Design a protein around this motif. Structure first.
Motif, mmCIF file in Angstrom:
data_model
loop_
_atom_site.group_PDB
_atom_site.id
_atom_site.type_symbol
_atom_site.label_atom_id
_atom_site.label_comp_id
_atom_site.label_asym_id
_atom_site.label_seq_id
_atom_site.Cartn_x
_atom_site.Cartn_y
_atom_site.Cartn_z
ATOM 1 N N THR A 164 111.458 92.573 -18.189
ATOM 2 C CA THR A 164 112.805 93.264 -17.720
ATOM 3 C C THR A 164 112.540 95.142 -17.174
ATOM 4 O OG1 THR A 164 113.536 91.028 -18.538
ATOM 5 C CG2 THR A 164 114.713 92.940 -17.243
ATOM 6 N N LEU A 165 112.400 94.889 -16.388
ATOM 7 C CA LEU A 165 113.054 96.407 -15.724
ATOM 8 C C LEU A 165 114.568 97.273 -16.758
ATOM 9 C CD1 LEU A 165 111.524 97.012 -12.805
ATOM 10 C CD2 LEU A 165 110.297 98.221 -14.478
ATOM 11 N N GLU A 166 113.174 98.576 -17.884
ATOM 12 C CA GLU A 166 114.474 99.139 -18.345
ATOM 13 C C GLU A 166 115.387 100.069 -17.125
ATOM 14 O OE1 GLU A 166 112.155 100.180 -22.387
ATOM 15 O OE2 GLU A 166 114.374 101.102 -21.805
ATOM 16 N N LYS A 167 114.977 100.647 -16.424
ATOM 17 C CA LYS A 167 115.718 101.121 -15.155
ATOM 18 C C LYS A 167 115.443 99.707 -13.909
ATOM 19 N N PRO A 168 116.597 99.311 -13.319
ATOM 20 C CA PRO A 168 116.147 98.279 -12.817
ATOM 21 C C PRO A 168 116.217 99.064 -11.228
ATOM 22 C CG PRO A 168 118.633 98.264 -13.648
ATOM 23 C CD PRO A 168 117.264 98.434 -14.210
ATOM 24 N N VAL A 169 115.891 98.863 -10.584
ATOM 25 C CA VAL A 169 115.113 99.600 -9.181
ATOM 26 C C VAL A 169 115.931 98.969 -7.831
ATOM 27 C CG1 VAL A 169 113.975 100.417 -7.319
ATOM 28 C CG2 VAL A 169 112.555 100.411 -9.776
ATOM 29 N N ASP A 180 108.933 104.364 -8.544
ATOM 30 C CA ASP A 180 110.310 104.023 -8.711
ATOM 31 C C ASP A 180 110.309 102.943 -10.084
ATOM 32 O OD1 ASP A 180 112.091 104.995 -6.992
ATOM 33 O OD2 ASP A 180 111.802 103.218 -5.685
ATOM 34 N N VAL A 181 108.551 102.141 -10.361
ATOM 35 C CA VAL A 181 108.881 101.752 -11.873
ATOM 36 C C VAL A 181 107.602 102.397 -12.570
ATOM 37 C CG1 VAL A 181 109.438 100.142 -10.086
ATOM 38 C CG2 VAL A 181 106.696 99.997 -10.805
ATOM 39 N N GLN A 182 107.220 103.572 -12.753
ATOM 40 C CA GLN A 182 106.286 104.402 -13.167
ATOM 41 C C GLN A 182 105.186 103.121 -13.639
ATOM 42 N N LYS A 221 113.479 93.918 -10.306
ATOM 43 C CA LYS A 221 114.193 93.934 -12.058
ATOM 44 C C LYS A 221 113.215 92.898 -13.135
ATOM 45 C CE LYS A 221 118.694 93.070 -12.981
ATOM 46 N NZ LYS A 221 119.632 91.825 -13.269
#
Ligand code: O6Y
Length: 188
Positions: free
Chosen positions: A11-16, A144-146, A158
């Motif tokens: 689960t992405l830490e910072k969702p886009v 955006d997702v590194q 997400k």
């Protein structure tokens, strides 16, 4: 739970926000990406498990292959602008990884010519500002997702697929678990 964070997905830490619903990242230099295309047909099998018409997006990345890697991101922008992804994906993969006949931007262009895209049509797209923004779009999505690794698939900005958490003794069972996971994430 049968599906859990850290197993089949993370689960992405910072969702886009506003991300494409199903977003795949790949490189023509990436060996698992080659298998995902030619041996597993991951995108095809995911599409068959999602509702009809939902948008799947597939973007190339710069971080493999240096100069040619960036040329290939521009060429993928050309392919998307002309709608010829299905015509050039296999010969680009094989030109980079199997025959190793793709060594320059001219060699990439030859793949498109052999696929039947006219020279003037390819060159006009290659130099177009429409393709420049398509390149920008691919870069922005990955930034955006590194993104530091491919193949990668994200769902709703997400959730990131975790193929290392799936069994690989049988290639068909793996493709199934992957596609079923995308479906479950999409319904989440
Ligand atoms: C049956 C089968 C299963 C596979 O599972 C995979 C295992 C790992 C990855 C990720 C990865 O390698 N990354 C990402 C982050 O770090 C850089 C490199 C992808 C697929 C792969 C190939 C095949 C085949 N044939």
């Amino acid at each position: 739970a049968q599906y859990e964070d850290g197993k089949q997905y993370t689960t992405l830490e910072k969702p886009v926000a506003g991300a494409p619903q199903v977003l795949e990242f790949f490189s023509f230099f990436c060996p698992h990406c080659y298998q995902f295309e030619e041996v597993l047909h991951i995108s095809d099998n995911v599409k068959k498990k999602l509702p009809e018409g939902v948008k799947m997006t597939k973007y190339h990345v710069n971080f493999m292959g240096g100069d040619l890697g960036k040329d290939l991101t521009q060429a993928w922008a050309v392919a998307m602008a002309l709608g010829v992804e299905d015509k050039v994906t296999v010969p680009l993969f094989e030109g980079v990884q199997k025959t190793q006949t793709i060594r320059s931007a001219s060699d990439i262009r030859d793949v498109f010519i052999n696929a039947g895209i006219k020279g003037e049509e390819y060159d006009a797209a290659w130099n177009s500002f429409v393709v420049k923004s398509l390149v920008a779009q691919q870069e922005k999505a990955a930034a955006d997702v590194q993104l530091r690794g491919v193949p990668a698939m994200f769902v709703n900005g997400k959730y990131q697929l975790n193929p290392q958490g799936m069994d690989t003794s049988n290639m068909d069972v793996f493709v199934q678990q992957y596609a079923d996971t995308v479906k479950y994430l999409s319904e989440k």
